Amino acid sequence: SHSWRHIRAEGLDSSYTVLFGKAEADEIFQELEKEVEYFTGALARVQVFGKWHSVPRKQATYGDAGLTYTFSGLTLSPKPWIPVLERIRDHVSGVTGQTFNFVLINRYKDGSDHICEHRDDERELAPGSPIASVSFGASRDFVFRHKAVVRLPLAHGSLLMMNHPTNTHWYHSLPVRKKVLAPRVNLTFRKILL
DNA sequence: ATGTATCACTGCG
DNA sequence: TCGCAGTATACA
């Protein structure tokens, strides 16, 4: 959390680092796999180009009561905060100064689970606050495209910080990587509005 | 109403 | 194995 690779271009502003060492990350990830309860059924379908699909991964959301989060036809309410999530949130707040009330958690069982190209833009995502993507497990390729391409390997225990207006000009994705066979759990902390 | 973007898929090179 | 091309409802 002292060594940052800054990513900057017209409309792009992100920062990356390895926040947790190997041991602390293994301990956390081992806790996450036990505690996190992933959504199922209706709560795991999105609507895109006219059709519903199951997401090719698992999703959960946690955060303060009453906040919601919508994208692609689906509204999610947060389950309440569990210690391991509290612990990751607060250590992230500690290095960034920033503060968060909500966390989307995506789990990729292996390298065929993915997330398609999108922007993480939306009204309820508050002004003046970034998005913090933390990762545990397998290492997976993360790509920015400007509708030019920056490819970023997200390592075990890393933190990708995503400031304004990265989200109002560039698309991101976690493409299929067939050669990866291990799980990845990603956490993206946000500061949402009522 | 009526305009606009698409957090997903398959096909194929 | 990867990634470009071409894709009927929301929700605005």
Side-chain angles (χ1 to χ4, degrees):
Chain A
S1 67
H2 275 267
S3 199
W4 300 87
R5 166 185 181 186
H6 296 310
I7 294 150
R8 296 189 223 273
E10 40 190 343
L12 219 204
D13 182 11
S14 305
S15 295
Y16 171 88
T17 166
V18 185
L19 215 214
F20 301 93
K22 181 184 179 177
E24 184 166 338
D26 282 6
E27 195 288 327
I28 289 164
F29 173 70
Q30 172 280 136
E31 280 198 19
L32 288 171
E33 292 285 72
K34 204 185 169 288
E35 302 279 323
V36 177
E37 295 196 50
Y38 295 95
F39 281 139
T40 59
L43 292 169
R45 271 172 98 76
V46 297
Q47 184 168 50
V48 177
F49 278 81
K51 338 211 212 207
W52 297 87
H53 321 270
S54 285
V55 301
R57 74 209 154 258
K58 307 195 173 165
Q59 304 176 339
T61 52
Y62 289 74
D64 297 343
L67 312 174
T68 61
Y69 181 52
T70 294
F71 61 103
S72 318
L74 178 77
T75 293
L76 289 337
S77 298
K79 301 160 133 109
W81 295 115
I82 60 169
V84 66
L85 296 194
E86 258 169 57
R87 165 176 176 214
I88 293 154
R89 171 204 68 191
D90 291 315
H91 185 35
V92 172
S93 277
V95 229
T96 52
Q98 281 293 327
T99 18
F100 308 95
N101 65 357
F102 187 94
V103 66
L104 178 63
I105 291 163
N106 281 293
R107 190 184 180 272
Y108 310 87
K109 58 172 146 61
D110 55 37
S112 89
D113 273 3
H114 61 278
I115 187 159
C116 289
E117 200 169 81
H118 71 287
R119 305 204 252 203
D120 249 281
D121 62 348
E122 353 223 272
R123 275 149 266 253
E124 67 208 49
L125 295 170
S129 80
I131 293 202
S133 170
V134 185
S135 310
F136 306 90
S139 171
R140 288 292 294 280
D141 282 325
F142 183 92
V143 180
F144 294 101
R145 278 183 70 247
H146 183 215
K147 156 163 185 196
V149 180
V150 177
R151 307 155 187 108
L152 190 64
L154 289 210
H156 198 47
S158 67
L159 169 57
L160 172 71
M161 284 299 277
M162 216 144 41
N163 324 314
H164 150 110
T166 307
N167 298 130
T168 97
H169 310 284
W170 296 63
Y171 288 84
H172 52 275
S173 64
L174 202 93
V176 162
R177 282 301 168 261
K178 284 244 202 195
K179 292 182 179 86
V180 172
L181 310 168
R184 190 199 167 234
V185 167
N186 171 93
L187 289 78
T188 19
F189 292 89
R190 297 133 192 281
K191 140 174 291 198
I192 307 244
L193 281 166
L194 299 60

Coordinates of all heavy atoms in Angstrom, one line a residue, chain A residues 15-74:
Chain A
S15 N -5.3 3.7 -10.1 CA -4.1 3.4 -9.3 C -4.2 2.0 -8.8 O -5.3 1.5 -8.4 CB -4.0 4.3 -8.1 OG -3.9 5.7 -8.5
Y16 N -3.1 1.3 -8.8 CA -3.0 -0.1 -8.5 C -1.9 -0.4 -7.5 O -0.9 0.3 -7.5 CB -2.9 -1.0 -9.7 CG -2.6 -2.4 -9.5 CD1 -3.6 -3.3 -9.3 CD2 -1.3 -2.9 -9.4 CE1 -3.4 -4.7 -9.2 CE2 -1.0 -4.3 -9.3 CZ -2.1 -5.1 -9.1 OH -1.8 -6.5 -9.0
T17 N -2.1 -1.3 -6.5 CA -1.1 -1.8 -5.7 C -1.4 -3.1 -5.1 O -2.6 -3.6 -5.1 CB -0.7 -0.8 -4.5 OG1 0.1 -1.4 -3.5 CG2 -2.0 -0.2 -3.9
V18 N -0.4 -3.8 -4.6 CA -0.6 -5.0 -3.8 C -0.7 -4.6 -2.4 O 0.2 -4.2 -1.7 CB 0.5 -6.0 -4.1 CG1 0.3 -7.3 -3.4 CG2 0.7 -6.3 -5.6
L19 N -2.0 -4.6 -1.8 CA -2.3 -4.1 -0.5 C -1.9 -5.1 0.6 O -1.4 -4.7 1.6 CB -3.8 -3.7 -0.4 CG -4.3 -2.6 0.4 CD1 -5.6 -3.0 1.0 CD2 -3.3 -2.1 1.6
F20 N -2.3 -6.4 0.4 CA -2.1 -7.5 1.3 C -1.0 -8.4 0.8 O -1.0 -8.8 -0.3 CB -3.4 -8.3 1.5 CG -4.6 -7.5 1.9 CD1 -5.5 -7.0 1.0 CD2 -4.8 -7.4 3.3 CE1 -6.6 -6.3 1.5 CE2 -5.9 -6.7 3.7 CZ -6.8 -6.1 2.8
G21 N -0.1 -8.7 1.7 CA 0.9 -9.7 1.5 C 0.3 -11.1 1.3 O -0.9 -11.3 1.5
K22 N 1.1 -12.1 1.0 CA 0.6 -13.4 0.7 C -0.2 -14.1 1.8 O -1.3 -14.5 1.6 CB 1.7 -14.4 0.2 CG 1.1 -15.7 -0.2 CD 2.1 -16.8 -0.6 CE 1.2 -18.0 -0.9 NZ 2.0 -19.2 -1.4
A23 N 0.4 -14.1 3.0 CA -0.2 -14.7 4.2 C -1.5 -14.1 4.6 O -2.5 -14.8 4.9 CB 0.8 -14.7 5.4
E24 N -1.5 -12.8 4.8 CA -2.7 -12.0 5.1 C -3.8 -12.2 4.0 O -5.0 -12.2 4.3 CB -2.3 -10.6 5.3 CG -3.4 -9.6 5.8 CD -2.9 -8.2 6.4 OE1 -1.7 -8.1 6.7 OE2 -3.7 -7.3 6.4
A25 N -3.4 -12.4 2.8 CA -4.4 -12.5 1.7 C -5.0 -13.9 1.7 O -6.1 -14.1 1.5 CB -3.8 -12.1 0.4
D26 N -4.1 -14.9 2.0 CA -4.6 -16.3 2.1 C -5.6 -16.5 3.2 O -6.6 -17.1 3.1 CB -3.4 -17.2 2.3 CG -2.6 -17.4 0.9 OD1 -3.0 -16.7 -0.1 OD2 -1.7 -18.3 0.9
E27 N -5.2 -15.9 4.4 CA -6.1 -15.9 5.6 C -7.5 -15.2 5.3 O -8.5 -15.8 5.6 CB -5.4 -15.2 6.8 CG -6.1 -15.5 8.1 CD -7.4 -14.7 8.2 OE1 -7.4 -13.6 7.7 OE2 -8.3 -15.2 8.9
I28 N -7.5 -14.1 4.6 CA -8.7 -13.4 4.3 C -9.5 -14.2 3.3 O -10.7 -14.4 3.5 CB -8.5 -12.0 3.7 CG1 -8.0 -11.1 4.8 CG2 -9.7 -11.5 3.0 CD1 -7.3 -9.8 4.2
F29 N -8.9 -14.6 2.2 CA -9.6 -15.3 1.1 C -10.2 -16.6 1.6 O -11.3 -16.9 1.3 CB -8.6 -15.6 0.0 CG -9.1 -16.5 -1.1 CD1 -10.1 -16.0 -2.0 CD2 -8.7 -17.8 -1.3 CE1 -10.6 -16.8 -3.0 CE2 -9.2 -18.6 -2.3 CZ -10.1 -18.1 -3.2
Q30 N -9.5 -17.3 2.5 CA -10.0 -18.5 3.1 C -11.3 -18.2 4.0 O -12.2 -18.9 4.0 CB -8.8 -19.1 3.9 CG -9.1 -20.3 4.9 CD -9.7 -19.8 6.2 OE1 -10.6 -20.4 6.7 NE2 -9.1 -18.8 6.8
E31 N -11.3 -17.0 4.7 CA -12.5 -16.6 5.4 C -13.6 -16.2 4.4 O -14.8 -16.6 4.7 CB -12.2 -15.4 6.3 CG -11.6 -15.8 7.7 CD -11.7 -14.7 8.8 OE1 -12.5 -13.8 8.6 OE2 -11.0 -14.8 9.8
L32 N -13.3 -15.5 3.3 CA -14.4 -15.1 2.4 C -15.1 -16.3 1.8 O -16.3 -16.3 1.8 CB -13.8 -14.3 1.2 CG -13.4 -12.9 1.5 CD1 -12.6 -12.2 0.3 CD2 -14.6 -12.1 2.0
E33 N -14.3 -17.3 1.4 CA -14.9 -18.5 0.8 C -15.9 -19.2 1.8 O -16.9 -19.8 1.3 CB -13.9 -19.5 0.3 CG -13.1 -18.9 -0.9 CD -13.9 -19.0 -2.2 OE1 -14.9 -18.2 -2.3 OE2 -13.6 -19.9 -3.0
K34 N -15.7 -19.1 3.1 CA -16.6 -19.7 4.1 C -17.9 -18.8 4.3 O -18.9 -19.3 4.5 CB -15.9 -19.9 5.4 CG -16.5 -20.9 6.2 CD -15.8 -21.0 7.6 CE -16.7 -21.9 8.6 NZ -17.9 -21.2 9.0
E35 N -17.7 -17.5 4.3 CA -18.7 -16.6 4.9 C -19.7 -16.0 3.9 O -20.9 -15.9 4.2 CB -18.1 -15.4 5.7 CG -17.1 -15.9 6.8 CD -17.9 -16.2 8.1 OE1 -18.9 -15.6 8.5 OE2 -17.3 -17.2 8.8
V36 N -19.2 -15.6 2.7 CA -20.0 -14.9 1.7 C -21.1 -15.7 1.2 O -20.9 -16.9 0.8 CB -19.0 -14.3 0.6 CG1 -19.8 -13.6 -0.5 CG2 -18.0 -13.4 1.2
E37 N -22.3 -15.2 1.2 CA -23.4 -16.0 0.6 C -23.8 -15.3 -0.7 O -24.3 -14.2 -0.8 CB -24.7 -16.1 1.5 CG -24.4 -16.9 2.8 CD -25.7 -17.3 3.6 OE1 -26.7 -17.9 2.9 OE2 -25.8 -17.1 4.8
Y38 N -23.7 -16.1 -1.8 CA -24.0 -15.6 -3.2 C -25.5 -15.7 -3.5 O -26.1 -16.6 -3.1 CB -23.1 -16.2 -4.2 CG -21.7 -15.9 -4.0 CD1 -20.8 -16.7 -3.2 CD2 -21.1 -14.6 -4.4 CE1 -19.5 -16.4 -2.9 CE2 -19.8 -14.3 -4.1 CZ -19.0 -15.1 -3.4 OH -17.8 -14.8 -3.2
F39 N -25.9 -14.7 -4.3 CA -27.3 -14.6 -4.8 C -27.5 -15.8 -5.6 O -26.6 -16.4 -6.2 CB -27.5 -13.3 -5.6 CG -27.6 -12.1 -4.8 CD1 -27.0 -10.9 -5.2 CD2 -28.3 -12.0 -3.6 CE1 -27.1 -9.7 -4.5 CE2 -28.4 -10.8 -2.9 CZ -27.8 -9.7 -3.3
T40 N -28.8 -16.1 -5.8 CA -29.2 -17.2 -6.7 C -30.5 -16.8 -7.4 O -31.1 -15.8 -7.0 CB -29.5 -18.5 -5.9 OG1 -30.6 -18.3 -5.0 CG2 -28.2 -19.0 -5.2
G41 N -30.8 -17.5 -8.5 CA -32.0 -17.4 -9.2 C -32.3 -16.0 -9.8 O -31.3 -15.3 -10.3
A42 N -33.5 -15.5 -9.7 CA -33.9 -14.1 -10.1 C -32.8 -13.1 -9.8 O -32.4 -12.3 -10.7 CB -35.2 -13.7 -9.5
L43 N -32.2 -13.1 -8.6 CA -31.2 -12.1 -8.2 C -29.8 -12.3 -8.9 O -28.9 -11.6 -8.6 CB -31.0 -12.1 -6.7 CG -32.1 -11.7 -5.7 CD1 -31.7 -12.0 -4.2 CD2 -32.3 -10.2 -5.8
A44 N -29.8 -13.1 -9.9 CA -28.5 -13.4 -10.6 C -28.8 -13.5 -12.1 O -28.0 -14.1 -12.9 CB -28.0 -14.8 -10.2
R45 N -29.8 -12.8 -12.5 CA -30.1 -12.6 -13.9 C -30.1 -11.1 -14.3 O -30.6 -10.3 -13.6 CB -31.4 -13.3 -14.3 CG -31.2 -14.8 -14.7 CD -32.5 -15.6 -14.9 NE -32.9 -15.7 -16.3 CZ -32.4 -16.5 -17.3 NH1 -31.3 -17.3 -17.0 NH2 -32.9 -16.5 -18.5
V46 N -29.4 -10.8 -15.4 CA -29.4 -9.5 -16.0 C -30.0 -9.5 -17.4 O -30.1 -10.5 -18.0 CB -28.0 -8.8 -15.9 CG1 -27.5 -8.6 -14.5 CG2 -27.0 -9.6 -16.7
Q47 N -30.5 -8.3 -17.8 CA -31.1 -8.1 -19.1 C -30.3 -7.3 -20.0 O -30.0 -6.1 -19.7 CB -32.6 -7.6 -19.0 CG -33.3 -7.5 -20.3 CD -34.8 -7.3 -20.2 OE1 -35.2 -6.4 -19.5 NE2 -35.6 -8.1 -20.9
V48 N -29.9 -7.8 -21.1 CA -28.9 -7.2 -22.0 C -29.1 -7.6 -23.5 O -29.4 -8.8 -23.8 CB -27.4 -7.7 -21.8 CG1 -26.5 -7.1 -22.8 CG2 -27.0 -7.3 -20.4
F49 N -29.1 -6.6 -24.4 CA -29.7 -6.7 -25.7 C -31.0 -7.4 -25.9 O -31.3 -8.0 -26.9 CB -28.6 -7.2 -26.7 CG -27.7 -6.2 -27.2 CD1 -26.6 -5.9 -26.4 CD2 -27.8 -5.6 -28.4 CE1 -25.7 -4.9 -26.8 CE2 -26.9 -4.7 -28.8 CZ -25.8 -4.3 -28.0
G50 N -31.8 -7.3 -24.8 CA -33.2 -7.8 -25.0 C -33.6 -9.0 -24.2 O -34.8 -9.4 -24.2
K51 N -32.6 -9.7 -23.7 CA -32.8 -11.1 -23.2 C -32.2 -11.1 -21.8 O -31.2 -10.4 -21.4 CB -32.0 -12.1 -24.0 CG -31.7 -11.7 -25.4 CD -31.7 -12.9 -26.4 CE -30.6 -12.7 -27.5 NZ -31.1 -13.5 -28.7
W52 N -32.8 -12.0 -20.9 CA -32.2 -12.3 -19.7 C -31.2 -13.4 -19.8 O -31.4 -14.4 -20.6 CB -33.3 -12.6 -18.6 CG -34.2 -11.5 -18.4 CD1 -35.4 -11.3 -19.1 CD2 -34.1 -10.6 -17.3 NE1 -36.0 -10.2 -18.5 CE2 -35.3 -9.7 -17.4 CE3 -33.2 -10.3 -16.3 CZ2 -35.5 -8.7 -16.6 CZ3 -33.5 -9.3 -15.4 CH2 -34.6 -8.4 -15.6
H53 N -30.0 -13.3 -19.1 CA -29.1 -14.3 -18.9 C -28.7 -14.5 -17.5 O -28.9 -13.5 -16.7 CB -27.8 -14.1 -19.7 CG -28.0 -13.5 -21.0 ND1 -28.1 -14.2 -22.2 CD2 -28.1 -12.2 -21.4 CE1 -28.3 -13.4 -23.2 NE2 -28.2 -12.2 -22.8
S54 N -28.3 -15.6 -17.1 CA -27.6 -15.8 -15.8 C -26.2 -15.2 -15.9 O -25.6 -15.3 -17.0 CB -27.4 -17.3 -15.5 OG -28.7 -17.9 -15.0
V55 N -25.7 -14.6 -14.9 CA -24.4 -14.0 -15.0 C -23.4 -15.1 -14.9 O -23.6 -16.1 -14.2 CB -24.1 -12.9 -13.9 CG1 -25.1 -11.8 -14.0 CG2 -24.2 -13.5 -12.5
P56 N -22.3 -15.0 -15.7 CA -21.3 -16.1 -15.7 C -20.3 -15.9 -14.5 O -19.1 -15.8 -14.7 CB -20.6 -15.9 -17.0 CG -20.8 -14.5 -17.4 CD -22.1 -14.1 -16.8
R57 N -20.8 -15.9 -13.3 CA -20.0 -15.7 -12.1 C -21.0 -15.8 -11.0 O -22.2 -16.0 -11.2 CB -19.2 -14.3 -12.1 CG -20.1 -13.1 -11.9 CD -19.5 -11.9 -12.5 NE -20.6 -10.9 -12.8 CZ -21.2 -10.7 -14.0 NH1 -20.8 -11.4 -15.1 NH2 -22.1 -9.8 -14.1
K58 N -20.5 -15.6 -9.7 CA -21.5 -15.3 -8.6 C -21.3 -13.9 -8.1 O -20.2 -13.3 -8.1 CB -21.3 -16.3 -7.5 CG -21.3 -17.7 -8.0 CD -21.5 -18.7 -6.8 CE -21.8 -20.0 -7.3 NZ -21.6 -21.1 -6.3
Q59 N -22.4 -13.3 -7.6 CA -22.5 -12.0 -7.1 C -23.2 -12.0 -5.7 O -24.0 -12.9 -5.5 CB -23.5 -11.2 -7.9 CG -23.3 -11.1 -9.4 CD -24.5 -10.3 -10.2 OE1 -25.6 -10.2 -9.6 NE2 -24.2 -9.8 -11.4
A60 N -22.7 -11.1 -4.9 CA -23.4 -10.8 -3.7 C -23.2 -9.3 -3.4 O -22.4 -8.7 -4.1 CB -22.9 -11.6 -2.5
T61 N -24.1 -8.7 -2.5 CA -23.9 -7.3 -2.1 C -24.1 -7.2 -0.6 O -25.0 -7.8 0.0 CB -24.9 -6.4 -2.9 OG1 -26.2 -6.9 -2.7 CG2 -24.5 -6.2 -4.4
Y62 N -23.3 -6.3 0.0 CA -23.4 -6.1 1.4 C -23.3 -4.6 1.5 O -22.8 -3.9 0.7 CB -22.3 -6.8 2.1 CG -22.4 -8.3 2.2 CD1 -22.1 -9.1 1.1 CD2 -22.8 -9.0 3.4 CE1 -22.2 -10.5 1.2 CE2 -22.9 -10.3 3.5 CZ -22.6 -11.1 2.4 OH -22.7 -12.5 2.5
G63 N -23.9 -4.0 2.6 CA -23.8 -2.6 2.8 C -24.9 -2.1 3.8 O -25.5 -3.0 4.4
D64 N -25.0 -0.8 4.0 CA -26.0 -0.3 5.0 C -27.4 -0.4 4.5 O -27.6 -0.5 3.3 CB -25.7 1.2 5.2 CG -24.3 1.5 5.8 OD1 -23.7 0.6 6.4 OD2 -23.9 2.7 5.7
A65 N -28.3 -0.5 5.4 CA -29.7 -0.8 5.0 C -30.3 0.3 4.1 O -30.0 1.5 4.2 CB -30.5 -1.0 6.3
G66 N -31.3 -0.1 3.2 CA -32.0 0.9 2.4 C -31.3 1.3 1.1 O -31.9 1.6 0.1
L67 N -29.9 1.2 1.0 CA -29.2 1.5 -0.2 C -29.6 0.4 -1.2 O -29.8 -0.7 -0.8 CB -27.7 1.6 0.0 CG -27.1 2.4 1.2 CD1 -25.7 2.1 1.3 CD2 -27.4 3.8 1.0
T68 N -29.6 0.8 -2.5 CA -29.8 -0.3 -3.5 C -28.8 0.0 -4.6 O -28.2 1.0 -4.7 CB -31.3 -0.5 -4.0 OG1 -31.8 0.7 -4.6 CG2 -32.3 -0.9 -2.9
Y69 N -28.8 -1.0 -5.5 CA -27.8 -0.9 -6.6 C -28.4 -1.6 -7.8 O -28.8 -2.8 -7.7 CB -26.5 -1.5 -6.2 CG -25.5 -1.4 -7.2 CD1 -25.1 -0.2 -7.8 CD2 -24.8 -2.6 -7.6 CE1 -24.2 -0.2 -8.8 CE2 -23.8 -2.5 -8.5 CZ -23.5 -1.3 -9.1 OH -22.5 -1.3 -10.1
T70 N -28.5 -0.9 -8.9 CA -29.2 -1.4 -10.1 C -28.2 -1.3 -11.3 O -27.4 -0.4 -11.4 CB -30.4 -0.6 -10.4 OG1 -31.4 -0.9 -9.3 CG2 -31.1 -1.0 -11.7
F71 N -28.3 -2.3 -12.2 CA -27.7 -2.2 -13.5 C -28.3 -3.3 -14.3 O -28.8 -4.3 -13.7 CB -26.2 -2.5 -13.3 CG -25.8 -3.9 -12.8 CD1 -25.4 -4.9 -13.6 CD2 -25.9 -4.1 -11.4 CE1 -25.1 -6.1 -13.1 CE2 -25.6 -5.4 -10.9 CZ -25.2 -6.4 -11.7
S72 N -28.4 -3.1 -15.6 CA -28.8 -4.1 -16.5 C -30.1 -4.8 -16.1 O -30.2 -6.0 -16.3 CB -27.8 -5.2 -16.7 OG -26.5 -4.7 -16.8
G73 N -31.1 -4.1 -15.6 CA -32.4 -4.6 -15.2 C -32.6 -5.2 -13.8 O -33.7 -5.7 -13.5
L74 N -31.6 -5.2 -13.0 CA -31.6 -5.9 -11.7 C -31.2 -5.0 -10.6 O -30.2 -4.3 -10.6 CB -30.5 -7.0 -11.8 CG -30.3 -7.8 -10.5 CD1 -31.4 -8.8 -10.4 CD2 -28.9 -8.5 -10.6

